[PDB]
Amino acid sequence: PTLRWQEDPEPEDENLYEKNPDSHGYDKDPAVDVWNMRVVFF
Amino acid sequence: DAPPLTLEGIKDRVLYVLKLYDKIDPEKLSVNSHFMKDLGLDSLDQVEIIMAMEDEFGFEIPDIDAEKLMCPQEIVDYIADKKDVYE
Amino acid sequence: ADLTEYLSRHYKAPRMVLAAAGGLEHRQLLDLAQKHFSGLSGTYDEDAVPTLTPCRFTGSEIRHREDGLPLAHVAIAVEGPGWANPDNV
Amino acid sequence: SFPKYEPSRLASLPTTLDPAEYDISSETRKAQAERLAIRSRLKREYQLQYNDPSRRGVVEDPALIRWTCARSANVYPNFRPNTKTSLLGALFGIGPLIFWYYVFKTDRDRKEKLIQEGKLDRTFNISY
Amino acid sequence: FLPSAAYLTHQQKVLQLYKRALRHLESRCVHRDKYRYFACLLRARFDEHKNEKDMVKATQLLREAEKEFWHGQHPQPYIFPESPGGTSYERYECYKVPEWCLDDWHPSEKAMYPDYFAKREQWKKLRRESWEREVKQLQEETPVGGPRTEALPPARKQGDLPPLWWHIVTRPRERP
């Protein structure tokens, strides 16, 4: 009889692994991941 | 530091040091035969038996588990749970 | 319920004493006690055994003033000797 | 046959000579029964939320969260400044501060007087 | 304070006092045979009034027994090197890696160990196979609303594994 809300229980706690197992720390686009490791480690 | 352990060797050692203790009989002493129900010896000497196994194998067993050994097969069960005695 | 728990907790066989005196035989009383009082009790409920802890003779006074009475009652008391010592004698 | 083992703030009284574990009443065993019921239900829900294969995060322990919110920021409500609170506050704050103030004025006045004498041992005292 | 029973009985309490006194007499007494002598003397002291059933005199004797235990106990008890307080006391808890992990590896290093990971896959399928229906129904049907104990019943009903076995079957070797 009381809800006060309409939103979902959010979010799904997506660990960035299990989908790109060679990835570095940040987002899943595998070209710019190599570009980022490149630009910081040079 | 390399002690090897196995099932039937430690069954032999438990059965052996029960055979060595005197006031039981060596005749009707099966692998799975009871302590209180059939041999008839009381609680106090049973805990002296538990003391003997602790003084042999190098680890105390607790009083929460000391109620419920009652036959040598269940003793070999609990010790094989302690040292993880399988391959 | 509380009377049930009191009955079960105290009226128990090792703390009760069947005493008789007079023109009777200890054979006959042992016989009749075996015929009747056997199977009475002997095992506490949840291992709830009552036990005498020692008590403290504090030493103090209470006066209850009530002047609408013809006489006055006074008691004065000191320490307990117990039972065992010959100080009782 | 013993001096009966007084406890302290630190020397905890072990479970043997309580002697409160002797005069067992009805509500003692009723309390132990309900206490086992509480521990039973809490381990039941714990082992339910502990063996789930779909479980990803932590088991999300509510009592540790509750104690954290207790010790951290629920100190201040409630609080009224009483006699005890204010007196212990003005003691523990201002007291040692004014103590160190007096000892530093003491040492500094001694030092200024001794170097105003002219005979400070400044034979070489360079790194000031 | 124990899993199954809500409390310990008095026979249990007398028995634990026996084991403690016997252990500290081991720790007290070197050369092991004069130990054996004193241990049978202690067992004789418990034979002196073993056959009495005055429960209130029994607990009176138990209180005086706790006093006479605490009078002459030993300072550093000889505790075994896996006991609480012992010389090891989970020595290799360093080397006890949990088994929910090991699957956050790399597929090259996963392909270095083929057969163990294939058998681990069929273990995990065994887990997820019979997790929901049998285990959850046996835990929401056979217990009472208040569970009132902690020993869970085995899966005597039809088929698969007894309930809630993952982190208890899958514990490490205690000496890796």
Helices E33-47 and E10-28 cross at an angle (nearest 10°) of 150
Distance of alpha carbon C43 from alpha carbon E82, whole angstroms: 40
Q: Domains plus CATH for chain B?
A: 9-83 (1.10.1200.10)
- Residue B63 bears catalytic tag: no
Beta carbons within 8 Å of E97's beta carbon, 6+ residues apart: E172
Of B48, B64, B84, the CB nearest to E173: B84
Burial of residue B82 (CB within 10 Å: 0-12, 13-18, 19+) is middle
From D32, which residue of chain C is nearest by alpha-carbon distance? C46
User: Residue D19 and residue C53: Cβ atoms within 8 Å?
Assistant: yes
Q: E148-157: b or e for each residue (b if 16 or more CB lie within 10 Å)?
A: ebeebeebee
Interface test with D, best of E55, E67, E132 (most D CBs within 10 A): E67
- Is C31 near chain D, with CB under 8 Å? no
- Which structure tokens are listed for D75? 């100190």
State the nearest Cα–Cα gap between E116 and chain A, in angstroms. Answer: 19
Phi and psi torsions of D21, nearest 5°? -90, 25
Distance of alpha carbon C14 from alpha carbon E55, whole angstroms: 8
Helices B7-20 and B43-57 cross at an angle (nearest 10°) of 130
Distance of alpha carbon C5 from alpha carbon C9, whole angstroms: 6
Secondary structure of residue D1 in the 3-state scheme:
coil
Helices E10-28 and E55-71 cross at an angle (nearest 10°) of 20
User: Residue C53 and residue D28: Cβ atoms within 8 Å?
Assistant: no
Tell me which residue has tokens 């013809």. Answer: C70
The answer to whether the CB of E3 falls within 8 A of the CB of E150 is: yes
Q: D36-73: b or e for each residue (b if 16 or more CB lie within 10 Å)?
A: bbeebbeebeebeeebeeeeeeeeeeeeeeeeeeeeee
The answer to whether the CB of B74 falls within 8 A of the CB of B68 is: yes
Q: What single-letter amino acid sits at D80?
A: R
* Catalytic member of B1, B22, B25, B42: B42
Tell me which residue has tokens 């749970």. Answer: B81
Beta carbons within 8 Å of E27's beta carbon, 6+ residues apart: E74, E76, E77, E78
Distance of alpha carbon B10 from alpha carbon A36, whole angstroms: 59
Beta carbons within 8 Å of C76's beta carbon, 6+ residues apart: none
Instruction: Report the helix count and the strand count for chain D, using DSSP H and E.
Output: 3, 0
The answer to whether the CB of A16 falls within 8 A of the CB of A27 is: yes
Largest CA distance in chain A: 60
Give the start-end residues of each E strand in chain B: none
- Which structure tokens are listed for B18? 């029960």
Q: Which residues of B touch E22 (CB under 8 A)?
A: 48, 51
Which resolution in angstroms does this entry have? Answer: 4.2
Q: What single-letter amino acid sits at E27?
A: S
Q: Which residues of E touch A22 (CB under 8 A)?
A: 106
User: What was the elucidation method?
Assistant: cryo-EM
